[model samples]
Target chain A: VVEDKRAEISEIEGKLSTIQAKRIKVEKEIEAKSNELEKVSKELESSERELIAAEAQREVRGNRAAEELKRSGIGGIYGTLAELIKVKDEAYALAIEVALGNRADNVVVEDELVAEKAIKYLKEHKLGRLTFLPLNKIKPKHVDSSVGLPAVDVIEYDQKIENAVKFALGDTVIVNSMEEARPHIGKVRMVTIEGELYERSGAITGGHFLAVDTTKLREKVESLRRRKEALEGELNSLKIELRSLENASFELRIKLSDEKKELELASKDL
Target chain B: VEDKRAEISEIEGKLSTIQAKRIKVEKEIEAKSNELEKVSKELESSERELIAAEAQREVRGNRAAEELKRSGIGGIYGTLAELIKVKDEAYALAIEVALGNRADNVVVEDELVAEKAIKYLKEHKLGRLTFLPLNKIKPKHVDSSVGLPAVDVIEYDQKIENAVKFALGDTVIVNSMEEARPHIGKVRMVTIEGELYERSGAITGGHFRARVDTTKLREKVESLRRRKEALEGELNSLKIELRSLENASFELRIKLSDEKKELELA
Candidate 1:
C-alpha cells in the first residue's frame, strides 16, 4: 500500500508538472495576443487620423481643380496642368511644381476657339480670372543645352496637350544648383531643385511654396484604408482566441487544486 | 519471523515497482529516439530541397517561384512531365517536343485561382506568369488519326485529356529528321528525335538540355518545410518527455538501492 501510494504520487506529480507547463505556454500566448491587440488598436486609431488628414488635403485639391475649371469660361476644361502632365521622375515633382507657380493652376482648354468664347463669358458674367492655355495655339520653345549645365524637362504631357504644356514648361530648365543656373541666367528661365527661379534678365527668386500635390495625398489615404482593414480583422480574431484561452486556464486551475489535494492525502503517513 | 517476512515482502514490492517503471522509461526512450531519427531525416531532406529551390529561383529570376507561392493549384499539378506518365519511353521526347514552352506553364485547378495568381502578380509586381486554367479551356479536336509516323501514347487518367490537349494539342508526330522538314508549315509535328515544326514554319530543333523546373522546385521546398516543422515540433516534445523519464528513473533507482541496503542490515 505504501509503494502504491508512492507510485500514485509520482504519476500525479508528472501530470501536475505537464499541466503546469502547458498552462505557462498558454498564458504566454494569451499575453502575446493581448499585446498584439493593444498595438493593433493603437495603429488603427493613428491610421484613421492619418486618413482624415489626407482626405482633407485631397478635397482641397479637388475643389481647386473644379473651381478653376468652372470659372475658366471655357466650354470644356481639359484639366489642370498637373493633371495633364505626367512627371516621369518623382524627384522632379516639387521642382516642376515650383517652376510653374500660379501657372500650375492655369486652365487647359480644348482649343483657341473655346478660349475665345471663355474670355467673352468671363467678361460678361464676371465669373473669375483664370489663366487659359489653348491646346492648339501655344508654341513650345527649345532649350539650349550648349551651356553644359545639369537640367531636366520636368513634366511629360499627352500628345493632345503637348503644345499647351510646352507653352508653360517647354523652355523651363530644372538645374541642380543656383551655380548651375548661373550660366543660363541671362539666356533661359532656370529653376533649381530647391525651388529657386532665375530669369533671362539675371533676376533671382527663391522661397518655400506650399502646394499640397493632392495626387500623392489621395494615394496615401488609399494605402491607409487597406492597413486599417487588416488591423481590425487581426484584432477581432485575437480577442476571440483570448477569451477561449482564459476559459481553459480557469478549468486547469480547478483541476490542479484537486490533484494537489489528492497528493497531500497520499503523503499523510509520511 | 513474521515481522521479517513483512519487511522482505514490502522491499520486494518496492523493487517490482522500480523495475516496472524502469521498463516503461526504457520503452519511452526507444520510441523517442525513433521519432528523433525520423525528424532528423525529414529536416535533412527539407534543407536539401530548400537549397535546390533557391538555386533554381536565382537562375529563373523569381518568376516561376512567385507563381507557385501565389496559389495551391501550382502545388498540385507541377508540370506536364510530372502529371503525365507514358508507358513507352520513346513517346517522352515526342510529347515534350509537342508541348514546347507550354510545358513550363503552371497548370491551375480553375479560372478563379488563375485570376488570383494574376492579381497577385500585378499587386506585388512579381513579374508576369502564364497559367493554364483547367476549367476554362476546352480541348480542340484535331485529327491525329491521319497516317503520320507518331508514337503511341499512354496516360493514366482519361479526365486529364483536355489538359493534355491544351498543352500538346493534336500534333502529328514524325519518325525522322527528314520527315520533320517536310511537315514545316503543314501540321504541328515533332520528330521522334525531338525536332519541332510549327504551323507557321518556325523550326525549333535543339539538343535536349535538362533544366530544373522552378515551380516544381518551389513546391517541393514548401512541402518539405511543412513536414520538417511538424516533425521538429514532435521531436522537441519527445525529448522533453524523455528527459523527465530519465530523471524519474534515476530517482527510483537510488531509492531501490537504499532499500536493498536496509534489507541487508535487517
Candidate 2:
C-alpha cells in the first residue's frame, strides 16, 4: 500500500510537469494569435472609417489609365493626375478638369521604373496606350501662387503627389471671370471659375462646361466596399483560429488541474 | 509452510487479475500496428505517384516558372500540356506534332493577366514567351458530324476550351495514310503516325515526339498526397494512445509476479 501510494504520487507529479510544459506553449500561442487578430482588426477598422468619409462625397468621371491602371492593380501606380486631384469648390470643377485636358490622361506612377513597366505592359498587350507621369522625375512649374489664385492653391491633394499636380496645373491661375483672366493671358496660364481658358500664348478658349462626372467617386466606394469584404473574411478566419487556440489553452488548464486533484488524492492515500 | 503455500495459491489466483486486462491492452497494440502499416503504405504510394507526375514536366528553358510568379496567382490556368490529356496513347505523337512548341505555352485567364505577366518578362529580360489568353484565342468551329475528331480523343478543362479547340478544331483522326486519303480537304485529318491533312486540302507531317495521362496522373498524385498527410496524423494519435495502454498492462503483469514470489518465499 505504501509502494502504491508512492507510485501514484510520482505519476501525478510527472503528469503535472508535462501539463506545465504544454501549458506554456499554448499560452504563448494564444498570445501571438491575439496580437495578430488585433493588428488585422485595426487595419480593418481604419478601412471602415475611410469608407464612411468617402460615402459622404459619393461623387471624376478621365485618364484612360485612371480606368485601366486601377483595374490592373499594378504596383506603384497612384492613379491619373485628373482622378487624384480635388477642386476646392464645385465652381472650379470643370475649370480644373478642362484646364488639365490631355495632361489629365497621363498616369501618375511612383517613379520612372514603374512608368516603364506600365508602358511595356501596355505595348506588349496592344492596350489603349497613354503616357505615364513619374512623380520623382517631374518638377512642378514654378509660378507665383501669391498673385490671383494659382490653380494648385485652390486644389486639395495629397502632398506626396504634389509634384505631379503642380507640374500640370501650378502655372495656371484661377480668376473669377475671363475679364479677370485678361491681365495674366500670355504672362501665365489661367482658367476662369466659369470654365474659360486663357493660355500664356494669349489664346482664349471658352465652351459650355459641365461639372466632372461622379463615376470615379462611385468607383472609390466600390474599391473600399470590396476591401471591407476582403477584411471581413480575413478577420473571421483570425477570430476562429484564436478562439480555437484559447479553447485548447483551457483544455491544458483542465489537464493541469486534473494532476493537482490527483496529487491531493494521492497525499490522502499516503 | 502450509500458511505460505495457501497464501501463494491465493496470490497466484489473484495474479489471474493481471491476465484479464493484459490481452485487452495487447489487443490495442496489434490493431494500432496494423493501422500504422496501412498508413505507411498509403504514404509510400503517394510519394511514388507524386514522383511520376513531376517527371511529366519538361524542364527546358523553364523561365515560365519565374514569369508565372510575377503573374497574378488567380488568373493562371497552367501550361497547355499540363492542362490537357489524351484519351489514348496512340494520339500522343500526333497531338505533339500538331501542337509543336505551342504545346508548352501558358494559357492565361485573360488579356489582363497576359499583360501583367509580360510586364515582368521585359523588366527581368526573361524574353518573349508565347501565351494563349482564353479571351483572345478563337477556335475555328467546324462540325461535319466528324469522325473521331482530334479534340474528341482529348480530355481538357472546359475553361481551356478555346485554347484546346483552337489547336484541334474539328481536326479528325484516322489510323493510317490510306485511311486519311478520303478525308483530305474534307476535314482536317491527322493520322496516328502524326501526319496532318489540313482542312483546306493541305498536307503536313515530318517529325513527332510525345502522357498519354500525366494530367490525370498529376491529379491522382495530388489527391493521394493530401490523404497521406491526413492518414499520418491519424496514425500518430493511435500509436500514442496504444503506447501508454500497452506499457501499463505490461507493468501490471510484472508487478503481480513480484508479489506472487514474495508470498511464495514468506
Candidate 3:
C-alpha cells in the first residue's frame, strides 16, 4: 500500500511540472503581446496629435509672385492651376488639393520663352520664387484605369489650359480603399479617396497624410484603441487560466507531501 | 338767319370755355387722386416697416426695466434713449455709438432704486440691465473744439445730466471722417454715419442699413395717415367739380346744336 501511494504521488508531481511549465510559456507570451499593444497605443496617440495639428493649419494660398508677374504685363503668364480649375465636388476638394501639391501653385504661361522673360522680371524686382508650366511644351498624360476615378474627372477646367491641368494630375487614379489599390499601387500612381499617397515607384507614403481630412486618422485611432482593449483582454484571459492552473499545482504539491508522510508512517507499522 | 348764327357762335364759344374748364377740372382731379393714392401707399409702407422695427431690439435690454415698471419699482425713469434726447436726429447715431449698449440703460433716481431694480431682475430672472443712478454717475466732460461735444448735441433732464455726461460727455460728435481723425485716440468720437473711434485707438466703421429712429417713424406714420385721409376728402370734392363741368358742357353743346339747325332752316 505504501509503494502504491508513492506511485500516485509521482504521477501528481509529473502533472504539476507540466502545468507550471505551460504557465511559464503563457507569461512570456502575454509580455510579448502586451508590449505589442503598448507600441500600437503609442502610435494611436501620435496619430491623434498629427490629426489635431492638421486641423489647426488652415488652407492658405500663396499668390503674391503670381499676381505681381501677371500685373507686370508679362505676356503669356496665365493664372495658377488652383484658380484655373473649379472643383466639381467639395468632398474630394482637400484630397485633390493635397494631390495637386506644389503643382497647384505652378503658374501657367504661353510658352518657355515667356516663362524665361517672366522669371527675369521677378528676378529684377526680387519679387519671389515660382514654378512655371509652359502650355506649349506641357503634354497630357491619360490615366485609363477604373480602379478609382481619375483626379481630373472631379473638376471643370478651361480646355485651353487642359495641357497644364493634365500634366499636373491627369495620370493618377483615386481609390476608395488601400485594398482596392494593391494591384495598381506602383503602376500608374494613385491616391486613396481618404487621402493616402502612393508614388508610382513602389513607395508607400502617409498613414495620416499632412493637410488631409482628420476623420480618416480619427477613425484609425478609434479602431486602434479598441485593439488595445482587445490585446489586454487576451492577456487577462490567459493570466486567469494560468492562475487557476498554478493554484491546482499548489494543491497537488500539498497532497503529495501528505501522502509521503503517511507512506513513511505506514512503513514503520510494517 | 343772321340772329340764329350769331347766337349759335356765342353758344359755341360758351361751350368751348365750359369744355376747357372741364378739362382743367379733370387734370386737377387726376392730380388730387394721384396725390391721395401716393399718400395712402406711403402710409401702408411706413406702417409695415414700423411692424418690422418693433419686432427687432426685442425685450432683451428693455424686458427687465419694463417688468420693473409693471412691478412699480419706485424712481425708475426710462431707458437712456427715452430720458435723454438727441437735439438733432443727424447726431442720434453718434450719440448712440458713444453710449453703445448704455443707450438702453435704465435711468433711476438713486442707488436705492437701482438695488431694488437689480434684485427684482435677478428674482424674476428677466435679464440683466445696466443702470445710470443719477446721484452716483460722474460724467466725464470734454469741451468742443473741432467737433461738437456729445453733451451739447443731446438734451436730458437736469438731474440725469451726470448720467448722460458720464456716458458720453467726453465723446465728440464729428461731421465727417476727416474731422474725427484729429480727435480720435485722444477722446471718444463717433461720425454722423455711425462710425466709432474709441480712446483706446480702436476704430469701428461700417454702414449698417435701416438704423432709423422708430420714435420719429411712428409720428411720421401717424401724420401721413391723417394727411392721406384729408387728401382723399379733397379728391372727392374735385371729382364733384369735374362732373358739374361735364354736365354744363353737355347742356351748352345741346343748345349749340339746336341753334345750328335753326340757322340752316333760315
TM-score head-to-head 1 vs 2, winner: 2
DockQ winner between candidates 2 and 3: 2
* Least accurate 10 contiguous residues by lDDT in model 3 chain A: A53-62
Model 1, backbone clash pairs (residues 3+ apart or across chains), number: 0
Question: lDDT by residue for model 2 over A49-156, one digit each (tens)?
Answer: 443333222211123334555666579888766668888777668778767764665667877567656655554543433455667666677675444777876689
lDDT tens per residue, model 3, B1-266: 65656776777788888888888878878888888788888876776566545533432254345556887766778878778778745886667667655677777777567656666765665654556666656567885566778788777788777767777777887877678667655777877866566564334332223433778988999899889878878888888888687657655554554444444445
Q: Give me candidate 3's TM-score against the actual structure.
A: 0.32
**Candidate 1 clashing pairs?**
none
TM-score against truth, every candidate: 0.30, 0.31, 0.32
Give per-residue CA lDDT, model 1, range B99-203, as digits (tens): 644554555676455556555555655543445556644554456454253324646356555667755665767786566544445666777655555553333
Q: Give candidate 3 regions above 4 Å deviation.
A: A1-270, B1-51, B211-266
Ten contiguous residues minimizing lDDT sum, candidate 3 chain B:
B202-211
iRMS (Å) per candidate:
29.2, 24.3, 43.3
Candidate 2: regions farther than 4 A off: A1-270, B1-14, B54-97, B107-116, B119-129, B132-172, B180-189, B192-266
Candidate 2 residues B128-202, lDDT tens each?
A: 344566765667666675457777778898888887887777677778767865655577776775555555332
Quote the positional error of residue B27 for candidate 2 in Å: 2.4
The per-residue C-alpha lDDT of model 1 at residue B146 equals 41
Per-residue error for A39 in candidate 1, Å, reads 29
Which candidate, 2 or 3, would have the higher lDDT against the true structure? 3
